[PDB]
Ligand binder design. Structure first.
Ligand SMILES: CC(C)=CCC/C(C)=C/Cc1c(O)c(Cl)c(C)c(C=O)c1O
Ligand SMILES: CC(C)=CCC/C(C)=C/Cc1c(O)c(Cl)c(C)c(C=O)c1O
Ligand SMILES: [Fe+3]
Ligand SMILES: [Fe+3]
Ligand SMILES: [Fe+3]
Ligand SMILES: [Fe+3]
Ligand SMILES: [O-]
Ligand SMILES: [O-]
Lengths: 264, 264
């Protein structure tokens, strides 16, 4: 019931105390829809760099992971749920910057050049949201200390600054950098799943948060393993979309149709 | 058909030449849904400023309209379709900046503070899209000269800069400024409709563009008058949402639920 009578009212500020906090309202209605036993066979891939931009993208991602796994100490001593949930908490904060700077920029360009965008913006904005929902889920499982909260604030100041300037100069580099990020994400989350299937990591967070259960249309019988499965699937999707987008830039197809709009 | 086999492919760049350019792909599937004879009675309103921020917002909007109508010469000599379509072309370029800076910023804040956003971001992003589709429609009707294309590029450089810094400092001012923008938008577009109903402006662009016909689920028998009706309705919706949002900031409800998520 949204009509002229509501459009003509000045404010609905006086309605806020009678509207419920529902978990389905945290995202848009564009929710992934994975079937677990199919997404079980998401695999680990590597796209070959084309030339100098692509080598830059990959070396920067590899340099970043080696720094990150070494400083965060992920490597030595056994995997645990605490360092898994911890790691993801941190990285999912950065994770939703690229897609948002991307869609913001294609949006601004579409507005100033009065051109069509042909389905790109929506894909990058929903991507940004997806990653943000990754964050929302992990923060139901672990609430961070102050050091990690301060690190997250500064890490955003730098990556937003990096990504904004990187995307104005070379959208190709950004999409490719992201493609290569999600390659590592799919590796990490398949590490998580493998350590579970092998009993090396006995997960305890098996009451999947409500936020995630409605976001991924997961049953109440979904476990931690299933949550990591559907997150990893999301990551892989971003892996392809981004490498695809970068490729389109490489071929001067950046003003072409978003192929994923129809593959849908 | 989106599964592990597609998630595991590296790129779909080789599919782009076999995917059609459909007008429905230009937006997301979150389309307004107005009934013409109801939205016919959208009216002209004015929210009273609360205090200094609100007076600033309104005076800046009034100062901007008086400059704009005077320099653009909208005032003297009769209304025409050419100056109507022209005016809107220009203003709809700015029109979709606020909502995008808004959602980008609430998104970034949600990511760095690991907090819930409770349905706000999606509303501002879809708003930004809505205005952008206003732009897409008007550019089917009139293609601008170079002077206006150069003015649009510079006007974005300034408003994006203004709005970004304004929203970091006072989201309340921005939402309120926007509220007051849409007040004028609803006035302009009801001027358009009234000049039509009175024969002062005999519109010729009566083959509503395909982009708009699918975006607003308008029939092939929709005329120019109907297009302006549904644009004006959209504007009024933004008028309320924004004043509502500003009000929530005024009351320190900025971390509360987006009331519109449920009013839906
Ligand atoms: C960009 C930066 C400041 C650090 C990136 C370090 C890196 C490439 C880590 C791999 C990796 C990732 O790049 C991403 Cl995007 C995720 C989600 C995970 C999940 O655990 C992950 O392990
Ligand atoms: C912010 C700026 C550089 C100029 C704004 C001038 C102004 C307040 C014009 C009124 C107005 C508007 O503010 C908006 Cl947002 C629209 C869409 C129309 C439509 O014609 C409109 O007439
Ligand atoms: Fe992620
Ligand atoms: Fe990711
Ligand atoms: Fe508009
Ligand atoms: Fe508007
Ligand atoms: O991620
Ligand atoms: O507008």
């Amino acid at each position: 019931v949204w009509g002229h009578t509501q459009l003509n009212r000045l404010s609905f500020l006086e309605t806020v105390p009678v509207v419920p906090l529902r978990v389905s309202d945290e995202s848009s209605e564009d929710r992934p829809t994975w079937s677990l036993p199919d997404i079980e066979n998401v695999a680990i891939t590597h796209k070959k760099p084309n030339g100098l931009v692509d080598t830059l993208a990959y070396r920067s991602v590899r340099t970043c992971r080696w720094l990150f796994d070494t400083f965060s100490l992920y490597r030595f001593g056994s995997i645990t749920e605490s360092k898994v949930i911890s790691r993801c908490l941190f990285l999912e904060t950065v994770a939703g910057v690229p897609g948002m700077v991307g869609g913001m920029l294609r949006h601004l360009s579409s507005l100033r050049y009065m051109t069509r965008d042909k389905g790109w913006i929506n894909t990058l904005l929903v991507e940004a949201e997806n990653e943000r929902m990754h964050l929302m889920t992990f923060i139901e499982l672990r609430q961070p200390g102050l050091p990690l909260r301060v690190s997250i604030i500064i890490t955003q100041a730098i990556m937003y600054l990096f990504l904004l300037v990187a995307y104005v100069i070379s959208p190709r580099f950004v999409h490719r950098f992201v493609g290569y990020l999600e390659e590592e994400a799919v590796i990490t989350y398949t590490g998580v799943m493998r350590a579970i299937d092998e009993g090396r990591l006995r997960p305890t967070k098996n009451d999947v948060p409500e936020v995630a259960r409605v976001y991924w249309n997961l049953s109440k019988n979904a476990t931690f393993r299933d949550l990591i499965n559907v997150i990893r699937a999301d990551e892989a999707e971003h892996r392809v979309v981004n490498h695809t987008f970068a490729d389109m830039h490489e071929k001067r197809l950046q003003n072409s149709v978003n192929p994923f709009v129809v593959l849908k």
